[PDB]
């Protein structure tokens, strides 16, 4: 057996701080036999799960001819916002890896994926009442920003663009709010969830 096994797994997965996740990689091989103990979710220069992503776990089973690699874990509430490149590596019974040790040392490889760590914002319990829901005043925008800050205590200055919560949380004129994180990724909160018209009944 000199044919490498082949992993099928998305090229990008999104996970959220404070939440658990689970994604299934499947692998096939001409021999239908695997060395199950030599399965790794790894980075390019080690078989460990990599610096900053030590919380990535794996569970490996085989169902008939199909190797099933469960990529799972719980993202820490205080891990860094950003993304990483990691790899699902499998080994057939004959010792052939899906990716060679030379390829890792040096183009997307089999089993390669980007894992993006995101923050999911909590909505405030109550909306802010505003005079004109399409022309918020600066005071009303500040009140919306403070409502978001209050409901999102684990969103810290280090997590956002410019290390400044007051400028990274940008409230538009109709209350729709964009948060820009330290990796320049975004979260958009609809204004209908944040503001209501004063005396609108
Ligand atoms: Ca093989």
Residue numbers in the entry: 257 to 362, 369 to 463
What does the paper say about this structure?
Many streptococci adhere to protein-attached carbohydrates expressed on cell surfaces using Siglec-like binding regions (SLBRs). Siglec-like binding regions (SLBRs) are among the streptococcal adhesive modules that bind sialoglycans. SLBRs contain two adjacent modules: a Siglec domain, which shares some features with mammalian Siglecs, and a Unique domain13 with no close homologs outside of the family. The conserved sialic acid-recognition motif governs general specificity while sequence diversity in surrounding loop regions allows the SLBR to select between related sialoglycans.
We identified that a previously-uncharacterized SLBR from Streptococcus sanguinis strain SK150 (termed SLBRSK150) displays 62% identity to SLBRGspB but exhibits a distinct binding profile. In short, there was modest binding to each of the three trisaccharides, i.e., sTa, 3’sLn, and sLeC, but little detectable binding to any of the tetrasaccharides (i.e., 6S-sLeX, sialyl Lewis X (sLeX; Neu5Acα2-3Galβ1-4(Fucα1-3)GlcNAcβ; Fig. 1d), and sialyl LewisA (sLeA; Neu5Acα2-3Galβ1-3(Fucα1-4)GlcNAcβ; Fig. 1e)). To reveal how similar SLBRs could include or exclude different sialoglycans, we determined crystal structures of these five SLBRs at resolutions between 1.0 Å and 1.7 Å.
